[PDB]
Design a protein around this nucleic acid. Structure first.
Ligand SMILES: Nc1ncnc2c1ncn2[C@H]1C[C@H](O)[C@@H](COP(=O)(O)OP(=O)(O)OP(=O)(O)O)O1
Ligand SMILES: [Mg+2]
Ligand SMILES: [Mg+2]
Lengths: 539, 395
DNA sequence: AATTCCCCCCCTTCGGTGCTTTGCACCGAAGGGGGGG
């Protein structure tokens, strides 16, 4: 039935009227389904007939629920959404099974007809008017309006979530020994008090919900493991995701690659070692969503490794508050990192990957710090405590970087682990000039109006070299000058330049770059054993 | 109370919180709702501000802090009786400006009914088990810039009962903290203030004399290399912007030869004269560094290593109002967080308004940890700089 | 043809911002996808 919970007052944006959109021509089977739904909806008081006193309208349509044979009635409240008052959403995230503690008895419940059990504000009911089209196509049409929360309205999800919390508040307050996870109308209930006493406490919850309008049918109420909860497969001692199936097609389109990347990102949370870097770059120039895209034999390689990983069955474990959170990080190359959070060895609470590339110039140490930051904030959400890290970087390497970087960087309590792919700074700029080596006074400048310039060095020994070049800016000329100096040098070299754009790039100690010109400079700065860079005003 | 003309309310999201912070924050709000200071609201209120627990040093208890920075900027200029009644000269001078907590005074005056919507905040949940619990303030909140001004009539009336029997002491109020300075010994300055706390029970230490620094003295050397002279002209061309008139003409004409960086080149008479004279120009601050209240303060921070920092408070580029250094080597965000707090306290005592920080840190690193080592009550408005500075021009 | 709504995530793209050496680096919002209800 309809719950007696007080309705949430809602307003329209100032100076805005209700929508007047027209109904689309629906097909036969959707019209018949809509008339059936609207007839029983009207009998229970969820919708009310209207007439010529209401000038508003909005198209309606239906889709099919996961469990088919049942239709979900939706309203395209797109014009009303632009005029409705703004809301503040209270759902701040998604619960994770890795954050679940071990409970002896567990029960999962689903509220039937969630939205249609919460009343809608009486002053707002006029704007929700719609019109089920003529059965077939000849009669005038029956106009209704919503007395409950409509499906498709921007305010419905926030109103229901607040209403459900108020309904559950009396029960949780008087039963503080029972954990209740609520996501919309999904209810996960688990505790001690073995199944004999657990079911008795569950019937008290269902009776409490029924008194407050909401009904939980026995078809959606699970009593024995495994429990299908929020896409997972909770077991008494472990949890796994619900099965993930990847397409096996041979002609891949842009949309198909996008679908595959999304599923692998979803699967890369309990399955370790998933990489999507080579698959993702296939979308870096595409325009249409239905063009066939070939696989570059590197995306084929990644899709073969990912398919092998997903073939074996993996599972997670439950959080133990009386133990320590440990997170290991591994470098996968090409700016890819993986991590696993565990409390006992070889028993993962959670897994994941980090592959974002921030900035046009970066190195391994900067990326590893970014990976640690992402894990730290993710761990705070799920467990409320930061984990102990096991980074593949030596303490000396980290100590040298953070005492010389111009920014402030920190990593929480961590321990070095000797996983072969170690993180290391590749070169190091000296702090004083080299005695016994040549000095290069190298810089060139281009023109702002013709787009060409020159770049070369002058040495203290008298040698020099110049090369004109076009289609390059003033900044690009300077980088080509420094690169050129490292070219025509020995093993020890002192470089003096008259602009700071190249200095900021080079002192940052990158090992990879999104610009080609910086990349060979890195290949040159690694060969030399001692390099010193000095800046001088342009005079 | 009213909002700034043609504006709206805060709409900032709430960042995740530690379990200990969440557990303490919920308990604080549970005991706060029983008193009427906050009340539960729904999602129909479109405004929100962040919140976190800020347990202070030598307190062993948690304190609720609400980020009201965005609300303060959109709130119509709120007058103490005209703006802020004290502009204390002698607070920046005396000996011992003590900072004490007002804290619970605001939780007596209810807030205007129509303005209560803007002071909305959400308490998160661990592993998102329940939707966030929303609250709004009924009493004056802590952190709002208009909150001290409403209590001013109830604040300026508890000064005379003490400030009239202790005249020369200048008491300054900024947000929920009271600054009071006395040129008394630690034995006296502590006893009298102790009664001030007792005079503020039923009636419901910074030293601004070591503040000056501002040095740019050049290094002294007998054997000068071409690289060293290169490091001087570069340092004395930027310095020609801070101090107009710095003369290096003949300190560069000896750099016209393209020899090595390790050559020991002697200085001519003109170069020695110019180098010696330019020290004198560096002994006097730039003439005409005016402070006008209609502009905003900007405070850069630079990292110098070994736990040493440096800052410059200025309203106009290359017109510095106060340049200083901060000293101590295992936590970097902890040091930077403490440096920000000291700079803000200094700016309040001198000019009365918090500056705009340009933090030398990656953006994402800041929120993850700044709430951990923070111990103040106000929050300065800050922005981040993604650019490596020049060689050490302040070290 | 599709036509809906809120939340989290990832990946790519484009316009605004700041310093400017008027190009180049950062960043946030909007498109696609995954998952949940
Ligand atoms: N596609 C959707 N569009 C809009 N709202 C939706 C959609 N899917 C789910 N919701 C919202 C409205 C539902 O009332 C609420 C709960 O989801 P769900 O249980 O699937 O629906 P329901 O409770 O109406 O059906 P049932 O009676 O079968 O449980 O989530
Ligand atoms: Mg369901
Ligand atoms: Mg349901």
């Amino acid at each position: 039935p309809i719950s007696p919970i007080e309705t949430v007052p809602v307003k329209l944006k100032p100076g805005m009227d209700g929508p007047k959109v027209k109904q689309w021509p629906l097909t036969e089977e959707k019209i018949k389904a809509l008339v059936e739904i609207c007839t029983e909806m009207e009998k229970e008081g969820k919708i009310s007939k209207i007439g010529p006193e209401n000038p508003y309208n909005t198209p309606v349509f239906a889709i099919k629920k996961k469990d088919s044979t049942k239709w979900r009635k939706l309203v395209d409240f797109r014009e009303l959404n632009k005029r409705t008052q703004d809301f503040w959403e209270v759902q701040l995230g998604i619960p994770h099974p890795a954050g679940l503690k071990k409970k002896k008895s567990v029960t999962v419940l689903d509220v039937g007809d969630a939205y249609f059990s919460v009343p809608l504000d009486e002053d707002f009911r006029k704007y929700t008017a719609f019109t089920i089209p003529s059965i077939n196509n000849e009669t005038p049409g029956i106009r209704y309006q919503y007395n409950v929360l409509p499906q498709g309205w921007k305010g419905s999800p926030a109103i229901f979530q607040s209403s459900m919390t108020k309904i559950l508040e009396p029960f949780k307050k008087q039963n503080p020994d029972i954990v209740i996870y609520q996501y919309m109308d999904d209810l996960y209930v688990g505790s001690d008090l073995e199944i004999g006493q657990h079911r008795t406490k569950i019937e008290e919850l269902r009776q409490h919900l029924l008194r407050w309008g909401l009904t939980t049918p026995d078809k959606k109420h699970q009593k024995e493991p495994p429990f299908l909860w929020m896409g997972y497969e909770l077991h008494p001692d472990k949890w796994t995701v619900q099965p993930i199936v990847l397409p096996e097609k041979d002609s891949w389109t842009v949309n198909d690659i996008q679908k595959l990347v999304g599923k692998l990102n979803w699967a890369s949370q309990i399955y370790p070692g998933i990489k999507v870097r080579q698959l993702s770059k296939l979308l870096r120039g595409t325009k249409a969503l239905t063009e066939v895209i070939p696989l570059t034999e590197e995306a084929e390689l990644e899709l073969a490794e990912n398919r092998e990983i997903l073939k074996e069955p993996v599972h997670g474990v439950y959080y133990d508050p009386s133990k320590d959170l440990i997170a290991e990080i591994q470098k996968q190359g090409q700016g890819q990192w993986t991590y696993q959070i565990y409390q006992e060895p070889f028993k993962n609470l959670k897994t994941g990957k980090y592959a974002r590339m921030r900035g046009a110039h970066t190195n391994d140490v900067k990326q590893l710090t970014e990976a640690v930051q992402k894990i730290t904030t993710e761990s705070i959400v799920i467990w409320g405590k930061t984990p102990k890290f096991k980074l593949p970087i030596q303490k000396e390497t980290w100590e040298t970087w953070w005492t010389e970087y111009w920014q402030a960087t920190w990593i929480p309590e961590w321990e070095f682990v000797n996983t072969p792919p170690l993180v290391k700074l590749w070169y190091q700029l000296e702090k004083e000039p080299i005695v016994g080596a040549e000095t290069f006074y190298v810089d060139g400048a281009a023109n702002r109006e013709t787009k060409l310039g020159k770049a070369g060095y002058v040495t203290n020994k008298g040698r020099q070299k110049v090369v004109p070049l076009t289609n390059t800016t003033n900044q690009k000329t300077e980088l080509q000058a420094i690169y050129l100096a490292l070219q025509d040098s020995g093993l020890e070299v002192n470089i003096v330049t008259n602009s700071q754009y190249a200095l900021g790039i080079i002192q940052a100690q990158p090992d990879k770059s999104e610009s080609e010109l910086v990349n060979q400079i890195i290949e040159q700065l690694i060969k030399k054993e001692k390099v010193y860079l000095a800046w001088v005003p342009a005079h | 109370v009213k909002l700034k003309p043609g504006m709206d309310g805060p709409k900032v999201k709430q960042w995740p919180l530690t379990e200990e912070k969440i557990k303490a924050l919920v308990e604080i709000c549970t005991e706060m709702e029983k008193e009427g200071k906050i009340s539960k609201i729904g999602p129909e209120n479109p405004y929100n501000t962040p919140v976190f627990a800020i347990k202070k040093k030598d307190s062993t208890k948690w304190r609720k802090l609400v980020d009201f920075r965005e609300l303060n900027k959109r709130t119509q200029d709120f007058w103490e009786v005209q703006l802020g009644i004290p502009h204390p000269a002698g607070l920046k001078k005396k000996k011992s400006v003590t900072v004490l907590d007002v804290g619970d005074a605001y939780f007596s005056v209810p807030l205007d009914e129509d303005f209560r919507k803007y002071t909305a905040f959400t308490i998160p949940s661990i592993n998102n088990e329940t939707p966030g619990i929303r609250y709004q303030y009924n009493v004056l909140p802590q952190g709002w810039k208009g909150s001290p001004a409403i209590f001013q009539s109830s604040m300026t009336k508890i000064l005379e009962p003490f400030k009239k029997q202790n005249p020369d002491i200048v008491i300054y109020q900024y947000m929920d903290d009271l600054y009071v300075g006395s040129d008394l010994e630690i034995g006296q300055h502590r006893t009298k203030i102790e009664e001030l706390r007792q005079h503020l029970l039923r009636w419901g230490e910074l030293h601004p004399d070591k503040w000056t620094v501002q040095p740019i003295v050049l290094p002294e050397k007998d054997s000068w290399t071409v690289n060293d002279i290169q490091k001087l002209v570069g340092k004395l061309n930027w310095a020609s912007q801070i101090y107009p008139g710095i003369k290096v003409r003949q300190l560069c004409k000896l750099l016209r030869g393209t020899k090595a960086l390790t050559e020991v080149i002697p200085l001519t008479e003109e170069a020695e004269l110019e180098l010696a004279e330019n020290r004198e120009i560096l002994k006097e601050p730039v003439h005409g560094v005016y402070y006008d209240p209609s502009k905003d303060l900007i405070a850069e921070i630079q990292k110098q290593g070994q736990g040493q920092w440096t800052y410059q408070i200025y309203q106009e580029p290359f017109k510095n109002l106060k340049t200083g250094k901060y000293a101590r080597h295992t936590n970097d965000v902890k040091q930077l967080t403490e440096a920000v707090q000291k700079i803000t306290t200094e700016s309040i005592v001198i000019w009365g308004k918090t500056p705009k920080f340009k933090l030398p840190i990656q953006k994402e690193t800041w929120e993850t940890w700044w709430t951990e080592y923070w111990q103040a009550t106000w929050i300065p408005e800050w922005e981040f700089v993604n650019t490596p500075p020049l060689v050490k021009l302040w070290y």
